[PDB]
Amino acid sequence: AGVQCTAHSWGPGRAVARLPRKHGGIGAYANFARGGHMAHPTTVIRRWCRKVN
């Protein structure tokens, strides 16, 4: 989720912020972009159970 599209930074010199952008110029691949990935995606390897003697 968030990483199926193609996006790369435009660099400095075009008067825009440096995040990755889709062809056309739309923001992507940031947690602060609409349609980007989570900063730290949830994962099923969280330890769900606990031990008791």
Partner 1 sequence: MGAYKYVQELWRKKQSEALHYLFRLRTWEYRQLNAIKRCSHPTRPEKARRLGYKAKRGYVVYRVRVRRGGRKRQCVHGISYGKPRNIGIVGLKPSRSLRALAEQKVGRRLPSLRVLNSYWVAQDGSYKWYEVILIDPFHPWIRNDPKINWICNPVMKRRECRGLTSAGRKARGLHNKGIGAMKLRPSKRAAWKRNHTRSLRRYR
Binding residues (CB under 5 A) for K ion: these are: 17-18, 35
40 binds RNA (CB under 7 A): no
As measured in angstroms, the least distance from the Cβ of 34 to RNA is 22
Residue 21 binding: pick among Mg ion, RNA, partner 1, none (C-beta 5-8 Å cut-off by kind): Mg ion
- Residue 37 CB-density burial (10 A; 0-12 exposed, 13-18 middle, 19+ buried): middle
3-state secondary structure at position 9: strand
Q: 21 or 48: whose CB is closer to Mg ion?
A: 21
Tokens of 23: 């062809």
